[PDB]
């Protein structure tokens with residue numbers, strides 16, 4: 001099994017306040033599950049080769065996704081911003097596989113990644129535990 | 143807009159305790175978002191013709207999905223039990239669309255539905271508010 | 285230390301739906317903390333001789349408290365129903381101590397307790413793990 | 427009635443990650459209730475003259491309380507850091523009343539308050555809606 005535990009840090013009220021609106025899990029490697037404990041979010045996966053996505057919406061209406069998973073026994077992550085209402089996590093998650101237009105960032109196996117949406121909201125995924133089967137990452141909104 | 147607010151009732155400790163492990167939203171009708179308030183779960187949709195799925199897992203390991211949405215301005219629902227690890231909600235949700243294998247129960251626009259898993263766990267989705275754009279349903283595990 | 289993990293089962297929609305509105309921890313035994321994990325609630329205490337209270341409110345307006353703790357190395361529990369808005373958990377919890385009017389039920393060290401409110405709501409606390417430092421109980425609204 | 431809705435912003439992963447471990451409501455003004463919606467926390471009170479406390483614990487062991495209420499029709503707030511484990515919210519909340527050691531900061535009716543714990547963690551409560559019966563504050567950990 002692989003697990004990825006996330007801590008959500010939101011740094012700038014000027015960017016509004018984000019909450020989770022969707023949680024998906026891709027079907028590879030026997031799938032997996034999202035759980036909550038002590039204000040954190042853990043994706044537990046049946047093996048290497050799958051992932052899950054959390055979609056966030058701010059109280060200002062901004063939509064963004066955070067994808068985390070394990071590819072070839074190494075953690076990966078991605079952030080997609082400027083999403084439209086119809087571009088749900090259910091749309092986004094599969095795009096990382098089957099030669100989708102996002103598979104390339106998965107193959108990068110990034111232990112850290114950041115991007116700034118066009119509206120000026122910075123997002124970052126940063127693994128604090130980058131090795132082994134019990135991975136840990138901070139998700140930082142700013 | 144169409145919203146569906148769910149109250150989860152678990153009646154029989156002998157069946158274990160279920161918790162949400164996934165929450166998807168289908169991309170039709172401008173998509174939508176899940177939110178939580180006062181222990182309830184609300185699916186807010188940008189119009190008629192879309193849906194979302196909650197996948198539950200018991201602490202005994204039983205996996206089931208609850209689907210709710212609006213089709214042609216009328217609420218619909220379905221429950222799938224005996225799910226395998228790889229049959230995530232991300233897999234199940236799209237199966238109701240594009241003439242998928244589950245599109246038939248959606249077209250039924252059910253205001254109530256119940257079913258019992260082969261392992262003996264009863265599941266019921268009963269709408270308490272069956273009309274309008276602010277729908278209410280009880281999810282009952284037994 | 286001692287921990288008490290609670291699973292909340294709501295059995296009858298006719299009685300309304302309850303959500304937590306308050307969580308207290310008494311200051312004896314070096315205090316303690318409430319946490320949440322996978323839909324369950326755990327009270328962690330620094331030792332024997334303290335307790336915690338969860339206050340619930342139904343969407344019908346009913347107010348009740350669930351008290352759990354460890355007295356002389358044995359678990360105890362109590363349920364108070366028909367509470368007035370001013371009778372917060374902060375008021376109720378201390379009443380089990382210092383010769384308060386509720387101390388007697390703490391001293392009973394009950395592994396199980398049920399009561400039915402004047403308005404007809406049944407409540408039960410039933411420990412499933414009754415001994416040791418890691419106690420488990422079901423909380424049943426009916 | 428009065429309500430105070432809180433958005434929690436955690437800015438610095440170096441300070442650890444905080445989660446709620448207790449929520450109390452003082453018994454004045456006919457009491458009140460805590461609720462959760464879309465990742466925010468709302469304290470609803472039966473009138474002016476009461477309050478409630480949120481105690482947080484970081485995954486680094488830091489214990490702090492945030493107090494918010496309404497005094498003489500004006501919002502107030504306070505933050506206490508460096509708490510011992512026996513100093514539960516149940517102990518701290520009443521200290522703002524009956525001429526307790528914290529009554530003085532309640533009387534200040536502050537719309538903003540910040541303080542840094544001896545161990546280096548900055549805490550701030552800043553109301554964004556400072557007037558009326560529907561108050562809004564950001565709670566910022568740094």
Ligand SMILES: CC(=O)N[C@@H]1[C@@H](O)[C@@H](O[C@@H]2O[C@H](CO)[C@@H](O)[C@H](O)[C@H]2NC(C)=O)[C@@H](CO)O[C@H]1O
Nearest residue numbers: 078079080081082101102105114115116117118
């Ligand atoms: C369908 C669509 O709009 N595709 C992309 C759009 O998502 C977009 O976003 C980037 O997506 C990559 C790969 O998933 C991310 O690493 C990156 O963070 C996204 N960029 C931003 C600014 O959010 C753009 C740019 O590649 O191109 C559209 O076609």
Ligand SMILES: CC(=O)N[C@@H]1[C@@H](O)[C@H](O[C@@H]2O[C@H](CO)[C@@H](O)[C@H](O)[C@H]2NC(C)=O)[C@@H](CO)O[C@H]1O
Nearest residue numbers: 220221222223224229243244247257258259260
């Ligand atoms: C891949 C798979 O799961 N195949 C079949 C299952 O879908 C399946 O269940 C039934 O699906 C209907 C349509 O979604 C539901 O309305 C119905 O409640 C559900 N039945 C149960 C008992 O869960 C099972 C059992 O029919 O067969 C599989 O082959």
Ligand SMILES: CC(=O)N[C@@H]1[C@@H](O)[C@H](O[C@@H]2O[C@H](CO)[C@@H](O)[C@H](O)[C@H]2NC(C)=O)[C@@H](CO)O[C@H]1O
Nearest residue numbers: 362363364365366385386389398399400401402
């Ligand atoms: C201030 C007040 O109303 N006090 C009494 C109530 O608490 C009360 O309740 C009973 O308190 C017992 C001890 O805590 C509980 O074990 C018991 O379950 C509870 N009874 C019910 C029906 O909830 C009433 C009635 O006994 O008397 C009040 O004076």
Ligand SMILES: CC(=O)N[C@H]1[C@H](OC2[C@@H](CO)O[C@@H](O)[C@H](NC(C)=O)[C@H]2O)O[C@H](CO)[C@@H](O)[C@@H]1O
Nearest residue numbers: 504505506507508527528531540541542543544
């Ligand atoms: C730094 C801090 O948290 N200040 C609090 C203030 O704190 C207390 C500490 C630190 O000054 O001093 C102790 O003597 C006090 N006694 C006990 C038993 O804790 C303790 O309260 O309290 C005031 C009033 O609540 C707050 O406004 C400051 O933020």
